[PDB]
UniProtKB/Swiss-Prot annotation:
GO terms for biological process: proteolysis. Belongs to the peptidase A1 family. It is an enzyme of class 3 (hydrolase). Residues 17-328 form the Peptidase A1 domain. The keyword Disulfide bond applies. This is Endothiapepsin. It comes from Cryphonectria parasitica. It comes from the Eukaryota. It catalyses: Hydrolysis of proteins with specificity similar to that of pepsin A, prefers hydrophobic residues at P1 and P1', but does not cleave 14-Ala-|-Leu-15 in the B chain of insulin or Z-Glu-Tyr. Clots milk.
Length: 330
C-alpha cells in the first residue's frame, strides 16, 4: 500500500504545516501537525477542557463506530518549547492520503497548554519519530508509520515541505519526479528515539564550506534551524545589523536586509537553504526588526534540523531494519 497527502503552511511565515487526517467511522477529518520529532498521535477532542478549545476541529469518539476506549491508558507529553498536552486513549481507524491503519492509538486530549489553544489551525499532532518515545502508559503505543510499515510497498515516508506553498507527505514510495539529482543517504542513530544524523558541515552564502560534524535531528515539527552557537554566529555575522537579543529570545536582523543562503552537508552532497527561507518577519506587528530562522541550540541540548532546513530538500525517512535518512535538492 501507499499514501499521499498534501501538507499546507498554517500561515504566511510557514510557522508549521498541517495535513488532513481521517479518523473514525464515518471519517472525522482533522488537520494534524506531522512531527518527526515526537511519537504521539494526539487530537483535540470532545474530552478537551472547553476553555482550552478555541476554533480547533475536535474528534468525538462517541460518534465513531470503530472507536474503542483503550482501558486504563493515559498519556502526557511536554515538548521542547514548553508546550504540553495530556489525556486518555482510544483505538480507531486512521487514514492519511488513502493509507489506512486499523487499531491506531488516538490520544484524546483532556488538557492542552495555552500555545495549542492559541493555534486554531492545528487540531493535534501525528508523531513520526520512533515508537520508543511514545508516552502512553502503562502500555506504550506505536506510531502511525510503525503500524503501517509492514503493509507499505517500501518501509519509508517522505517529507517535501514547501516554502510559502503546499507540499507533500508520501508513505510507502519515493516519488522520483519530486526532486532533482540524486538522493544522498546518511546514517541514523535511534538511541534517543529521533531521526538523528550527522551533517558533514556548512557554508554561509558564497563562502567556503567548513567540514565539521554536526549531530542533530530531522524534525518536521520544529519551525526553525537550531545549530551550535559557533555556526549561528558565523551566519549572522554576514548580516549587517544582526544581533542576538536576549529580550526577544534569539537573533534578530534589520527587515531591510538581504539574507545570505546557508548550506548544510549530507555526506559529500550539499543542501542550499535560500536566504529568504531564513526570514521569519517582524518580531511584532509593524516592527523593522525581523526574527531569524537560524538560531542557537545552546541550552536546547540538541541541534535541530527543523522546517527551515527540511523545506529546502526532499527528505526520505527510511524505516528499514537499519533506518537511514536521505536528502535530495529539489
Amino acid at each position: 500500500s501507499t499514501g499521499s497527502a498534501t501538507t499546507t503552511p498554517i500561515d504566511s511565515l510557514d510557522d508549521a504545516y498541517i495535513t488532513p487526517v481521517q479518523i473514525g467511522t464515518p471519517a472525522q477529518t482533522l488537520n494534524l501537525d506531522f512531527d518527526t520529532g515526537s511519537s504521539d498521535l494526539w487530537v483535540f477532542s470532545s474530552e478537551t477542557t472547553a476553555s482550552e478549545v478555541d476554533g480547533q476541529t475536535i474528534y468525538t469518539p462517541s460518534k465513531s463506530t470503530t472507536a474503542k476506549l483503550l482501558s486504563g491508558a493515559t498519556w502526557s507529553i511536554s515538548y521542547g518549547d514548553g508546550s504540553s498536552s495530556s489525556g486518555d486513549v482510544y483505538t480507531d481507524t486512521v487514514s492519511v492520503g488513502g493509507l489506512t491503519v486499523t487499531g491506531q492509538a488516538v490520544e484524546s486530549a483532556k488538557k492542552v497548554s495555552s500555545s495549542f489553544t492559541e493555534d486554531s489551525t492545528i487540531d493535534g499532532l501525528l508523531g513520526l519519530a520512533f515508537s520508543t518515545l511514545n508516552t502512553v502508559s502503562p502500555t506504550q503505543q506505536k506510531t502511525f508509520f510503525d503500524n503501517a510499515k509492514a503493509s507499505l510497498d517500501s518501509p519509508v515516508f517522505t517529507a517535501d515541505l514547501g516554502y510559502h506553498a503546499p507540499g507533500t507527505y508520501n508513505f510507502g514510495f519515493i516519488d522520483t519526479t519530486a526532486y532533482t539529482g540524486s538522493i544522498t543517504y546518511t546514517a541514523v542513530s535511534t538511541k534517543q528515539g529521533f531521526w538523528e544524523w550527522t551533517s558533514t558541515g556548512y557554508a554561509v552564502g558564497s563562502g567556503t564550506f567548513k567540514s565539521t560534524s554536526i549531530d542533530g535531528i530531522a524534525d518536521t515539527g520544529t519551525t526553525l534551524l537550531y545549530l551550535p552557537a559557533t555556526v549561528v554566529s558565523a551566519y549572522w555575522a554576514q548580516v549587517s545589523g544582526a544581533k542576538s537579543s536576549s529580550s526577544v529570545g534569539g537573533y534578530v536582523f534589520p527587515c531591510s536586509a538581504t539574507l545570505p543562503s546557508f548550506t548544510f552537508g549530507v555526506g559529500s552532497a550539499r543542501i542550499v537553504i535560500p536566504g529568504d527561507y531564513i526570514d521569519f518577519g517582524p518580531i511584532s506587528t509593524g516592527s523593522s526588526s525581523c526574527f531569524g530562522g537560524i538560531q542557537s541550540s545552546a541550552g536546547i541540548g540538541i541541534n535541530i534540523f527543523g522546517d527551515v532546513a527540511l523545506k529546502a530538500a526532499f527528505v526520505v525517512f527510511n524505516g528499514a531494519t537499519t533506518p537511514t535518512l536521505g536528502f535530495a535538492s529539489k
